[PDB]
Amino acid sequence: RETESWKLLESSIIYYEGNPIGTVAAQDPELAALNYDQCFLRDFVPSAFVFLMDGQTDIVRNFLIETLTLQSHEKEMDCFQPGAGLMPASFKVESDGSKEYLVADFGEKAIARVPPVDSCMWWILLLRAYEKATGDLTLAREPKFQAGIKLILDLCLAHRFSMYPTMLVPDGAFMIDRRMGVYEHPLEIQVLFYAALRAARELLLPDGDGEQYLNKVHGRLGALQYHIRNYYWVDLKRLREIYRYKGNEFGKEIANKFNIFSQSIPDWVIEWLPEKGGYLAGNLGPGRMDFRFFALGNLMAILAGLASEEESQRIMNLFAHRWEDLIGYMPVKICYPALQGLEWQIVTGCDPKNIPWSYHNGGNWPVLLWLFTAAALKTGKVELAHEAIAIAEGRLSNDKFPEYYDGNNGRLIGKEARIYQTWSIAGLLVAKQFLANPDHVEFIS
Amino acid sequence: TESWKLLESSIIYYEGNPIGTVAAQDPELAALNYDQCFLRDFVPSAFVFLMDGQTDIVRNFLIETLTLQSHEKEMDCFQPGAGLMPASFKVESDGSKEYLVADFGEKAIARVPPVDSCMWWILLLRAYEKATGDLTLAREPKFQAGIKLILDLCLAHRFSMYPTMLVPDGAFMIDRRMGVYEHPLEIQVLFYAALRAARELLLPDGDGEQYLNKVHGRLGALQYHIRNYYWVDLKRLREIYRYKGNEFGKEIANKFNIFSQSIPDWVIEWLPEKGGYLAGNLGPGRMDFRFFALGNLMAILAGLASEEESQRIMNLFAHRWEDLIGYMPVKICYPALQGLEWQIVTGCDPKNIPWSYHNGGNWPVLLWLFTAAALKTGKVELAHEAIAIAEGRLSNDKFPEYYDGNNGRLIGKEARIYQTWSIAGLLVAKQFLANPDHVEFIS
Amino acid sequence: TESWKLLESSIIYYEGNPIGTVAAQDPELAALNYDQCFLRDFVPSAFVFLMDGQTDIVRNFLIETLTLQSHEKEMDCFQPGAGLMPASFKVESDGSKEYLVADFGEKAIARVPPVDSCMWWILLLRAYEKATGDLTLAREPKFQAGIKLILDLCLAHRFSMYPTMLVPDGAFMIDRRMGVYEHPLEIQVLFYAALRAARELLLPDGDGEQYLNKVHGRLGALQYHIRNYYWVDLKRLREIYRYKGNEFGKEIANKFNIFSQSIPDWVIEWLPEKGGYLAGNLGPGRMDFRFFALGNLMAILAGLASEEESQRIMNLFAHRWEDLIGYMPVKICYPALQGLEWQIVTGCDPKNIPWSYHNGGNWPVLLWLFTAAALKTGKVELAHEAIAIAEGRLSNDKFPEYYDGNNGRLIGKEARIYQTWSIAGLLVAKQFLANPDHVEFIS
Ligand SMILES: OC[C@H]1O[C@](O)(CO)[C@@H](O)[C@@H]1O
Ligand SMILES: OC[C@H]1O[C@](O)(CO)[C@@H](O)[C@@H]1O
Ligand SMILES: OC[C@H]1O[C@](O)(CO)[C@@H](O)[C@@H]1O
């Protein structure tokens, strides 16, 4: 409470009719406001965890209520309506004369019109975190909330043309909200999908059509976990198998179901893995396996229990063995390796914000520290959590809590990073609070 | 003729009745899935049979595929939407007993979803009705239910603001990984056309009215979106080229955040003054400027493109004839992904090397769409020329599945011979030429 | 042991007698030519049998291959030299009757010539005699005639000033297009070794003296040429790097006109101070700086390299252990051809992608040569380590033909399992380790 960071977090709070309802993304005094003066649903999560652990839960309750109201608001682009269940990427408070009102971005204001797919999942997860932290079960059981959950599930569980139980998205549909070759079936979306289904199973009442929703949830839940665990898992044993796959196999009972051509498996993968390491791949689809390591997807896979115990140990072993690549001078690298040269051009459409080792394209993101700490505590690798926190702690305050860091090893402050980025401040606080009392990790697991 | 006899021998029979045609009758290559009837491949065969007058095979096909729609489809305990039509099917027997076996994507190479198959089914059902006058078929409760299941799948709520359909890579005629994921033109145009057909085929009875309302609504949004965002011409390119990056807000010009420095050099030089086309794809940070022939030709036929847009697409074909027709109509898409682009986008797919197969190969089947579109736009002479090019080679080459090279000079690297829709494509084109009124069945 | 039982089941029988061993016993892959006994592959099998004491199979092999040498070999009316030994052979039957069928290059993929096979035959005949003490075999007129035919082919006059042997690409263990055309080290070293063996095996009777004289003469010139022009160390690299281009005349330093700007960057950093090796190739305007393991190890064993050179090759292995042994001894050559170099040099050969198969793959069979060379140079501890690496994986992996990756971590992309010379290689290495005196049979 008396810390510098806590006071920065307090100033970030957004008020609405005299009540705290969220936090701004950043308080950078110089850069263009752009959309950084808005409360992003994904950014609020670590803020919420600080507030819940501290004991002031009104802000989180208020956030959940107002975002539920935003769900019923109308969204249009060229006058077409998406599903009613879509949660917004972000919102802020405006005022026309005397009265305050909330304005939101559901993707129709967003740069590149990216859909905030992860936002509705984070909302479910935060609702669950709220329940477990406070003990207040009544909020989620209110008819409003039940309906809101169900609208999210309608979109998530929408019928597919394909045989894949994964969720299909366009590029830039999560924390990585720009064109980064994370289209189709990105790990992060699948892991958050799995976690949200697990949560919905706790939150849903069987009343009315509730039993119908639970049925839909449980069927997808098992299929999704099987699919991810069996086809996304990468280790040396599995790589040896994939590398020897024959191409152009037709039929049900074939090994190479997705028609991966082993001559396309990148050079770096084979040398990068340690004997006792492993990870969930970045993406899988027709003719495609994305071997990039994505930190958020893997860490949440440990916390949500999607990964098995052994798989969770092997992910942490990878972090230990490739510490320079994945932590370096600032935890945690968002994905590894960076897209470079002509691959950057082709995959990102020459996006100047995502040059090699910058931002989404292999930058290091302080916020991810809270996930890493949680995961390290859960797998009983506390020493890793401690070293990671020590690294971040030695720079963040001095650098004024940047949004992200750049370079192979995170040496540079992010090229266009906002300073006083709220989830960089909150991430460090959450990590320290988890370390001080490891039982609080149960809020997210 | 030689072609008719070949088409006849391709017919699959089931309990004594014709129900479809095999993809190819190659004497030497591995069967793989080429001994099956593909829903997309059967379309031109069906047209031959409809115009000839033997319509039983088409009626039977429509009935058997409807039945297949209700088959149990599964991979590792997951079910797709109930409306999904198969990629293909064949007949198998246990002793005396015969039964149909289908690939819904669970057997398919790379597990690609046959998203186009359900749209082609609706279009063929409409073509059947218009051509025969048999209104009894589509009216049947089973057929009404079947159309609706497809609409349930096509119109299911999504996360994005736009009304286009989201698909994985390889979801249509291009059924391998080719960077046609997200919002490929072919899917959007087939979707539009299928919706227009559904509008005519749905009975109002019960919830039919609800379906018709949703269809009408989507048709409007879809036509607007496609025409206003996919259309490429010199004037539009000048606009896009001058777009500012990283615009945030509802009221911005560069909504999808295209960076003009990434616009390929070939595009600006390739378009003639009076030419234009619908782009291959659109999504976050992405515009695929490749020209896709099927999408563009079907846009003309379905009335998705305006009359002027249709004329400008045909102007493009005339001006860039060597590129898009060359020695074999029609080039499936232009230009080819080359070098490291081929590696990155296809995952080093050996069947789609540059200027081969899906990656800028030339496909004889497309001649029937080109001929239809040419007739509709009043470019009869282009139809004559394209038909003359194909007829000069196909028979001598034993009707290859596809041709390769910048200008289609090579027989396809792995092309099957006696590919059914290559034979049916030529026949259909000549039938249309003889009686242009038959173009109505697909327009 | 498991390995012995596997080696036994690989034996080919012919009219009731053992005459060779199949290349692999893969339960699943296409036979291709892996159901044949290769002359090069049989060598380590032969050594196992010689050291065990069952020498009939080796005697029978030598006899049957000699007979094959006299078989009619043809492609489009052209005959090679009469001394050519086959790449491989197998047994076939017409009803009850059995007969041998051989591949001399006329069946081979890419029509590659098995130049190494005839040299391996001579070396095995010498190994047989030394190990058994049966001097009656090589003395037979038929065997004398057979040795001479091989020498006629090896020593036939050529156009070049140097005494090395000119070959097309893919003429040895590396039997595919890998830029090992012209004067590859392996051929020159095997040639030298075969000549040394021929010196012991030839009777003086009749023209035997003439042959012995030519052999003696070539041995001298060949050893000088190889040692003085193929040897690479830091001191030599400093010389070559400072060579002037386009020197004309007898008395010039840069005889082969190597341009020092073309010397690859990796070479200078890779060599340790006390390390060195024989280069992979030499010819007009060309020095192939790739390290080739078989050539270098056989140079040690045949006494072609000096004692110091032998120690410096072993120093290279110790210093660059991860590169040359890694997780599976031994890397066939280093480094891999990559990117456009792979395309240009291999013609985009899919079996030889970077760090795979011939193109920098790791080959268990080579362990027997490495162990022999290590014993001979007094580096017993390196032998122990390499053997420990292989034994920790081969049985669990079902004895793959080869391993892939920079450090041999992958099982070979298209590796057959139960590859005979992988099994025989390990057994031979352990046999040598137990009794180093047996190294004499190949030295
Ligand atoms: O609206 C989407 C935009 O929002 C950001 O997260 C911050 O401005 C960008 O990464 C993205 O382009
Ligand atoms: O099952 C899908 C496969 O079917 C084909 O159309 C023909 O074999 C291929 O293009 C594709 O990979
Ligand atoms: O016939 C020559 C062929 O035999 C092989 O050794 C095994 O199939 C290949 O390396 C080569 O291409």
Side-chain angles (χ1 to χ4, degrees), chain C residues 366-388:
Chain C
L366 297 178
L367 182 59
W368 80 257
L369 284 162
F370 183 77
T371 300
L375 286 165
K376 196 192 207 280
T377 54
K379 304 292 186 173
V380 188
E381 63 283 336
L382 303 189
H384 290 312
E385 184 59 32
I387 285 163

Side-chain angles (χ1 to χ4, degrees), chain B residues 120-141:
Chain B
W120 278 120
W121 185 86
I122 288 173
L123 294 171
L124 186 46
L125 179 55
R126 177 200 157 103
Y128 169 81
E129 191 177 296
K130 288 188 65 165
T132 66
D134 171 20
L135 313 166
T136 73
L137 195 64
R139 290 208 300 253
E140 284 169 34

Side-chain angles (χ1 to χ4, degrees), chain A residues 240 243-244 262 270-271 273, chain C residues 404 406 409 411-413 415:
Chain A
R240 284 178 191 114
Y243 181 75
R244 280 161 61 72
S262 56
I270 310 313
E271 296 165 306
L273 280 172
Chain C
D404 289 355
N406 294 56
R409 269 184 145 178
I411 299 166
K413 183 175 146 62

Side-chain angles (χ1 to χ4, degrees), chain A residues 55-86:
Chain A
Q56 55 180 123
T57 70
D58 292 330
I59 185 165
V60 183
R61 196 173 98 78
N62 294 350
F63 173 89
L64 293 160
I65 291 159
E66 297 295 347
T67 52
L68 179 60
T69 302
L70 292 174
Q71 194 185 41
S72 58
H73 282 198
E74 292 317 294
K75 317 93 175 197
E76 63 95 25
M77 175 179 152
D78 286 315
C79 322
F80 168 78
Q81 276 283 349
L86 186 58

Side-chain angles (χ1 to χ4, degrees), chain A residues 236 239-240 243-246 262-263 267 270-275, chain C residues 353-356 393 404 406-407 409-415 417:
Chain A
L236 282 173
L239 269 173
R240 284 178 191 114
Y243 181 75
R244 280 161 61 72
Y245 281 166
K246 312 196 319 185
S262 56
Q263 62 266 39
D267 59 332
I270 310 313
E271 296 165 306
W272 196 61
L273 280 172
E275 185 57 61
Chain C
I353 59 167
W355 306 114
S356 185
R393 302 182 71 191
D404 289 355
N406 294 56
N407 311 289
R409 269 184 145 178
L410 299 166
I411 299 166
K413 183 175 146 62
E414 308 184 33
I417 56 161

